[PDB]
């Protein structure tokens, strides 16, 4: 496995701009050495949970691909970024599979994503006809039809525009503050491994 380039974890974690959770961002990481040590002992991360593998063993592991999904939600919703969860985020925005293999990291981004008066650029989907399949993404803006009456593309009675804005303000309480979230998915196929820890 001839690999000498380091995986671009800093490009993901240290980006200036994060996507709204309904249009969540995905970067494919392959063909590189993954130095997870820059993630260890962070004074920033309020959530570091892994699934299927132990964090302590990440430098000894090889994967066919790694996927870096990133987005912003509110603090109270970080718990939904996990297998088996339910809620507006898990049902309508970002869904992890029951057999998820990977890690979920999150940190408070009040200093970057709040604005006195309200930062209305971060949206989430509130209504949807059915729940998302794992790793599905829905960016439609079709008016949600809540009654027997067709909506004909216009908001109204029983006819709601499906996205809603977080409107983050720095004075919000912690549960309503913006959190930046990175989901690393460790994909293993019947193919040679392209992402490996420094110890492999």
């Amino acid at each position, epitope marked *: 496995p001839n690999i000498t380039n380091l995986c671009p974890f800093g490009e993901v974690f240290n980006a200036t701009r994060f996507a709204s959770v309904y249009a969540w961002n995905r970067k494919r990481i392959s063909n590189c050495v993954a130095d*997870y*040590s820059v993630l*260890y*002992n962070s004074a920033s991360f309020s959530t*570091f*949970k*892994c*699934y*299927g*593998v*132990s*964090p*302590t*063993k990440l*430098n000894d592991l090889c994967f066919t691909n790694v996927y870096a999904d990133s987005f912003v939600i509110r603090g109270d919703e970080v718990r939904q970024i*996990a*297998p*088996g969860q339910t809620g507006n985020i898990a049902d309508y925005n970002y869904k992890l599979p*029951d*057999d998820f293999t990977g890690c979920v990291i999150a940190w408070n981004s009040n200093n970057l994503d709040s604005k006195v008066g309200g930062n209305y650029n971060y949206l989430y989907r509130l209504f949807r006809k059915s729940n998302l399949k794992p790793f599905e993404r829905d960016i439609s803006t079709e008016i949600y039809q809540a009654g027997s009456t067709p909506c004909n593309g216009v908001k109204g009675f029983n006819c709601y525009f499906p996205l809603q804005s977080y409107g983050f303000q720095p004075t919000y309480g912690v549960g309503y503050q913006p959190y930046r979230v990175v989901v690393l998915s460790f994909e293993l196929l019947h193919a040679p491994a392209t992402v490996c820890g420094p110890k492999k």
Partner: antibody
Amino acid sequence: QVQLVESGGGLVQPGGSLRLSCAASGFTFSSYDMHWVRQTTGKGLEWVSTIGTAGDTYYPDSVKGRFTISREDAKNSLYLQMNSLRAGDTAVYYCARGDSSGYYYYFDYWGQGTLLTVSS
Amino acid sequence: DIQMTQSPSSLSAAVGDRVTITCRASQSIGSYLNWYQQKPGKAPKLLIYAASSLQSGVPSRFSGSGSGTDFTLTISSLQPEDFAIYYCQQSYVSPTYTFGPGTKVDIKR
């Protein structure tokens, strides 16, 4: 024969601090993750802290900011510094070796426990 | 995290009896489940990992089965030295490993 031996438990006043030690023998200490797990009659077995082989430390929210795990591989030793102790921290504290078979992780070796009593 | 529940709470059985205790995870965890035995004054002892692999040195009368959310520990023939509390533990979510509340196995004589 793998052995783990805890030391340092005892009486400590609320708000005080205390260090627990665990001395390991019978294996290559540097090659394994080490853990602290506490036990109380009311809440059973509870994970307290973990240190890997890359300097990485992990704590539950109930413990972050108050406890610090560390290791001295040159002396095959594990430590848990504890600050701002509350009555609810009274427990038996075990050190435990972690290992894995494939992706499956387990605690294959435990110390004898050391009793921490937090009381004025 | 993931909550673990055990059944029964306690059990009285005779020597030679088949003992069966069950563990349930609050969500699907595949085979990421271990079983531990704890005798009075002693630390837990690993019996089973990966839901069904017998740890080295553990007697063969101990066995684990199950996948997903429900798991079972079985003692084929209860011996007196098996009096203890048995705990299950999910190894799916780290670092926040969580333990079941335990099942006490008393010996009837």
